[PDB]
């Protein structure tokens, strides 16, 4: 209860949190570095241009 | 990280030992109190006996009981003095433990700060390589 | 101080290798819960005697 | 009778702890799933992102 | 893992709901003490559910 | 708070 | 019920759950990915068109 | 590290909010000492938050 040196619950929580925090943070941080590229933000604009020009063709194609 | 990591493990074990010492001091206080309580109880019993002795008609026995009570009182007084000295020491130990608890948390925070500066230094080294 | 310095360097070499070897995650969880599931019963096997 | 009452109080104290310990171990059963799920989620990203 | 833990999260509510039977039936016996102990379980499951 | 809910639940 | 971790009733549930959960989760995930692909969807549309 | 500190800071703020509710609850309860203790805890939390 008071947490003697190897109290199995408390000691396990420490060892898991070491992995849990490091891995999850690495993945979020490295994911933001991989997502940092400006051309990828241009790919969002490109997806906007692509869906809007595809709609213009599509609405004409469905109209007849 | 290596200097910092070793220190954290070491401080926690020391704290447990300190707690045990505090418990012993607390136990000692209880024992002295019990002894003091026993002495008071003994004195009360002696007082009843002294009164009983007078009723009985044995003058010497009553006188002896009074002498015993004085000895018990002296012992009780000594115990009380010992308790007071012990109590001050106990209070200091308790204060230290509370301070230590605050301190260990601060040490953990320090490690995080230390880790960040080291990373910054590594980045500077990379620039030199270029 | 020289013995404390050898303690720094030797205990850090050994503990860094040990913490890297030891600390894969699923090993820890399933041990811990099994150990405390042992312990509750051990406690009851005490406390019964005193109840009685 | 003095001893009996004292140790009865001590036995209640032990039982109060057992009831709390039964919660404390339940919590330790529960977290495992989220931990594994987080771990595996991260490990998928760990492979993915380097490429 | 989402599908699995979502099933478990649904099942925590399914437990809360079933433990209404517990509290309701205890009230239908006049067992307030037992209904309180059911309400403690519905409370602890609610706490659990948020974390999930 | 369990009593407040319980007393309403038993009331009907 | 509570004396040992190795009791048959307690052990069977734990072993069965791990095996069952992994198999169910793996099968569902694989099936969903196949459905997601565009080519499979196109074929289904063609079949409907072919039927009328 | 920034995220962890922020999370810790967020946790401290959350803890402070919980403590504030508890302090108010303590006054309603009539336990004067408990409310005072909560205020002291909040100050410690604030100091930790400031340090963070």
Numbering used by the authors:
A (entry chain CC): 156 to 219
B (entry chain A): 26 to 155
C (entry chain B): 1 to 52
D (entry chain B): 105 to 155
E (entry chain H), H (entry chain G): 53 to 104
F (entry chain WB): 208 to 219
G (entry chain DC): 156 to 207
Direct quotes from the study:
By reconstructing the C14 symmetry ring (Vipp1C14), we achieved an overall resolution of 6.5 Å with highest resolution regions reaching 4.8 Å. This was sufficient to allow unambiguous assignment of the helical domains within the Vipp1 monomer and asymmetric unit and consequently the entire 2.4 MDa Vipp1C14 ring containing 84 subunits (STAR Methods). To build the Vipp1C14 monomer, a homology model was initially generated from the PspA crystal structure hairpin motif (aa 24–142). The Vipp1 hairpin homology model with its distinct axial twist closely fitted the Vipp1C14 map and acted as an anchor from which to build the remaining main chain. Vipp1C14 rings are assembled from six rungs stacked on top of each other. Each rung differs in conformation so that an asymmetric dome-shaped curvature is achieved when rings are viewed from the side. Rungs are maximally constricted at the top and bottom with internal lumen diameters of 14 nm and 15.7 nm, and widest at the ring equator between rungs 3 and 4 with an internal diameter of 17.5 nm. The basic building block (or asymmetric unit) of Vipp1C14 is a stack of six monomers, each one located in a different rung, which when repeated forms a ring. Intriguingly, the six subunits within each asymmetric unit have distinct conformations, which is made possible by three hinge regions that provide Vipp1 with conformational versatility. As dome-shaped curvature increases toward the top of the ring, helix α5 rotates from being oriented at 40° relative to the horizontal in rung 5 to a maximum of 80° in rung 2.
Proteins that perform these functions include Vipp1/IM30 in photosynthetic plastids, PspA in bacteria, and ESCRT-III in eukaryotes. Here, using a combination of evolutionary and structural analyses, we show that these protein families are homologous and share a common ancient evolutionary origin that likely predates the last universal common ancestor. This homology is evident in cryo-electron microscopy structures of Vipp1 rings from the cyanobacterium Nostoc punctiforme presented over a range of symmetries. Rings have an inner lumen that is able to bind and deform membranes.
